[PDB]
Design a protein around this nucleic acid. Structure first.
Lengths: 89, 290, 12, 66, 289, 74
RNA sequence: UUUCCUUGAAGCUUUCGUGCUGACCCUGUCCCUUUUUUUUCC
């Protein structure tokens, strides 16, 4: 019901809301932000301009990745823009 | 359920109609769902479309195209075609930014509508072109290409909901043109736009509004010109208490006025709407304020 | 037997 | 995982697993400039004829399936 | 001021608890000298049950404060005090306390605190045992490079906990292996980590979703620490093992090894004898100048 | 494939026999034209559901025959 | 070179019982459902 879109990784900076704000996206964690988020404008467009990469609210900041997911190199897979069971948009 | 007032209702619905459609087979879905196309009730059509929208998000457009493309060439009756076109639309809305590749084909369906004898089919058709472009954004311009030259002509001769619809399109086009070609064509529209502020229709005022956002929402349009022709009408007929009580119009408005600022400057706008913070009724005030 | 032949053509 | 090639599953045949690691051996050999040059030296050819040969042996290695 | 706040913390109602703990935080971070210690330790023993918060954000800044004061005073007590707290937290509610043990353990040299902690895994009360395990978990996650030392300290403990009492021991502990295994990376402490790999390994098999996705955590990290070649040397025999059950898994592992570091492997596929219809020996590598 | 046209007279005929007048069926049929040379078994799949999968084999088989053949004789 | 005790596991089927796991969850959230036999007059 809730899983990745994993469409190709564009240049568009990620956008996170109030709620999600601290979280390294995949490791769920606040620890050691280092490097930066990219998603496809397909995932990120329009009403999604500065939209949360989780909940559907306006982005007030920019998710940083952990270092943990870094050395395991996951940040480079398909764009982590979570699609819920329903149409994203 | 899919055609649902509640936001979370809908999204559930879509979720399961995919889960079914992908779950079942394509040819299952089709062989299933023809006959609802010509079903007398417009409702069941309408919804039936949004179904096909979803099943298409599941199984991809190109799987499903030859089917559609078949439908819009159905010569038995129009009611279908009214549907099949609608389908194009709700595809547009759902698949959105991703429509891009088969854009050309989709359009190559839908053109044969615009000229039709029946009205609605014209109407809905064009409407789709709009939605397309709105997912097209600044892209695929020439794919829409062979569409225009009717559209512009169509603009001239019309009375009614259809008319403003064709605007809904053109408006969403202009951002996609070359401000030399777009230049010309723009200069033609902003007239009809003018003459049309005034209608009682609300479908209208939404439309012509969003247009101005785009027409005079342009880089290749000249400042003074807006300052003269448009503004005084604009603030006249639109800024009124009809509007802001409604929801959408509230927003769409705010947007529009904002973009007229981004161009003609600030003090111009704000100057004219300051005096209304002290008008009594709230929602209005709230509006000027934001 | 038939359908899985076109399915296998879809595979390879 | 599936659309990422070289994925296995518990039904994996001997043959397939080995052909995999062949190919990957190759895109390494095209990769690592030196390793390549090593081969070239040993069996005397061009760099090219090496890479060419390899890219022949890509689909084959081990020969036909079973 | 700051005392004037202090009693508010009961307030039950939300918006209060939020803006308050926020405030207390800013001030106990920045000034923090202005207020005599005694007052603080009152603050501690009042904080402790802010950890009943239904909400995330409260606990969030709550913790970060707990740290700020822990700086102001000095550690031993404040963990000794945290050691006592979160007894009745329901299903992972207390953890935030553990998160205190962590952040605390940074904000003076953790190199101080362990012996207290480690020793406190002795206590027979089961759930607080596992608590201390997570403490190590977040602990290494928050320290990173520094782990190159206390690793030894934990290793035997990880051996005990990792050996059963119950799943949960193995789950959480294994997580410790993860964050350690990343953090140390490539400073040369592998040897031990190899050693632990053993007591990990058997855990591979279970249906218990948390235990498993834990273990996947483990072996993934351990891959980067040990390197593949060692891993792959646990994963060979598994591939073709007659049974289904094993093949299911050893494949799932070998995939996870495989996607990352596919480029490395080549070396580590062993020699394999060629049969009738085919050649499985890669002849290249044996060209000798 | 101008006999794909007069063919359309054929297809129309046979299916029209096998309930009367159905349109967009016939069009989902011939709608596999424009990929020309490329149309396959899947025709029997999709069409297989739309009509009763029984008649299916009958028709799409007969078609593939007339298509490979009149594909030759040109 | 003969004529004798007690015990012990599981597996399967049962809506009994109790601990526990995910920085899960407890606040975000409303926006293109707007659908009709074309039919708004210097």
């Amino acid at each position: 019901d809730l899983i990745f879109c994993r469409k190709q990784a564009g240049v568009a900076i990620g956008r996170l809301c109030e709620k999600c704000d601290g979280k390294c996206v995949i490791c769920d964690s606040y620890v050691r932000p280092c490097t930066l988020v990219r998603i496809c404008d397909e995932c990120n467009y329009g009403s999604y301009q500065g939209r949360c990469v989780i909940c559907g609210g306006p982005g007030v900041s920019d998710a940083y990745y952990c270092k943990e997911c870094t050395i395991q190199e996951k940040d480079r897979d398909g764009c982590p823009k979570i699609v819920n069971l329903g149409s994203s948009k | 359920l899919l055609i649902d007032e509640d936001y979370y209702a809908r999204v559930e619905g879509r979720e399961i109609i995919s889960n079914l459609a992908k779950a079942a087979g394509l040819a299952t879905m089709i062989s299933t769902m023809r006959p609802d196309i010509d079903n007398m009730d417009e409702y069941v059509r309408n919804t039936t479309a949004r179904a096909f929208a979803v099943v298409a998000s599941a199984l991809g457009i190109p799987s499903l195209l030859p089917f559609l493309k078949a439908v819009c060439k159905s010569k038995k009756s129009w009611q279908a075609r009214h549907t099949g076109i609608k389908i194009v639309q709700q595809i547009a809305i759902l698949m959105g930014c991703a429509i891009l590749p088969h854009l050309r084909s989709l359009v190559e369906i839908i053109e044969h509508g615009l000229v039709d004898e029946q009205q609605k089919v014209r109407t809905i058709s064009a409407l789709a072109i709009a939605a397309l472009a709105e997912a097209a954004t600044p892209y695929g311009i020439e794919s829409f290409d062979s569409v225009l030259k009717p559209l512009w002509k169509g603009i001239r001769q019309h009375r009614g909901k259809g008319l403003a619809a064709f605007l809904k399109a053109i408006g969403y086009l202009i951002p996609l043109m070359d401000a030399e070609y777009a230049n010309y064509y723009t200069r033609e529209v902003m007239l009809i736009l003018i003459r049309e502020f005034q209608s009682p229709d609300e479908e209208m005022k939404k439309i012509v509004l969003k247009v101005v956002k785009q027409c005079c929402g342009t880089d290749g349009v000249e400042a003074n010109y807006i300052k003269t022709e448009i503004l005084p009408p604009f603030f006249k007929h639109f800024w009124q208490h009809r509007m802001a009580l409604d929801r959408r119009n509230y927003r769409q408005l705010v947007d529009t006025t904002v973009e007229l600022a981004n161009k003609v400057g600030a003090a111009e706008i704000i100057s004219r709407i300051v005096d209304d913070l002290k008008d009594e009724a709230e929602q209005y005030r709230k509006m000027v304020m934001e | 037997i038939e359908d899985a032949v076109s399915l296998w053509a879809k595979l390879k | 995982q599936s659309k990422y090639i070289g994925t296995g599953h518990a039904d994996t045949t001997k043959w397939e697993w080995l052909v995999n690691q062949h190919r990957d051996s190759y895109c390494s050999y095209m990769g690592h400039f030196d390793l390549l040059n090593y081969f070239a030296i040993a069996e005397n050819e061009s760099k090219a004829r090496v890479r060419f040969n390899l890219m022949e042996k890509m689909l084959q290695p081990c020969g036909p399936p079973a | 001021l700051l005392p004037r706040l202090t009693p508010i913390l009961k307030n039950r109602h939300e918006k209060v608890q939020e803006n308050c703990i926020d405030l207390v935080g800013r001030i106990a971070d920045r000034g923090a000298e202005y207020v005599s210690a005694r007052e603080w330790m009152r603050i501690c023993f009042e904080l402790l049950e802010l950890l009943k918060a239904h909400k995330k954000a409260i606990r969030r800044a709550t913790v970060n404060t707990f740290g700020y004061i822990a700086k102001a005073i000095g550690p031993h007590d404040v963990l000794a005090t945290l050691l006592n707290n979160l007894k009745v937290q329901e299903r992972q509610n207390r953890v935030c306390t553990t998160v205190a043990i962590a952040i605390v353990a940074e904000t003076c040299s953790p190199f101080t605190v362990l012996p207290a902690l480690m020793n406190e895994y002795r206590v027979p009360e089961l759930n607080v045992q596992n608590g201390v395990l997570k403490s190590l978990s977040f602990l290494f996650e928050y320290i990173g490079e520094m782990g190159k030392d206390y690793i030894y300290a934990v290793t035997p403990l990880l051996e005990d906990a990792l050996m059963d009492r119950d799943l949960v021991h193995r789950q959480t502990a294994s997580a410790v292996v993860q964050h350690m295994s990343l953090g140390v990376y490539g400073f040369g402490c592998e040897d031990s980590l190899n050693h632990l790999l053993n007591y990990v390994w058997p855990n591979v098999f279970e249906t218990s979703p948390h235990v498993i996705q834990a273990v996947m955590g483990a072996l993934e990290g351990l891959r980067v620490a040990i390197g593949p070649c060692r891993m792959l040397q646990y994963c060979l025999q598994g591939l073709f093992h007659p049974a289904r059950k094993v093949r299911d898994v050893y494949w799932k592992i070998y995939n996870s090894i495989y996607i990352g570091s596919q480029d490395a492997l080549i070396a580590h596929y062993p020699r394999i004898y060629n049969d009738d219809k085919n050649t499985y020996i890669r002849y290249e590598l044996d060209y000798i100048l | 494939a101008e006999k794909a046209k007069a063919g359309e007279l054929k297809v129309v005929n046979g299916a029209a026999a096998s309930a009367d007048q159905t349109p967009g069926a016939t069009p989902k049929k011939l709608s596999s034209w424009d990929q020309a040379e490329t149309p396959g078994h899947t025709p029997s799949l999709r069409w297989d559901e739309t009509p009763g999968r029984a008649k299916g084999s009958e028709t799409p088989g007969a078609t593939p025959g007339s298509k490979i053949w009149d594909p030759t004789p040109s």
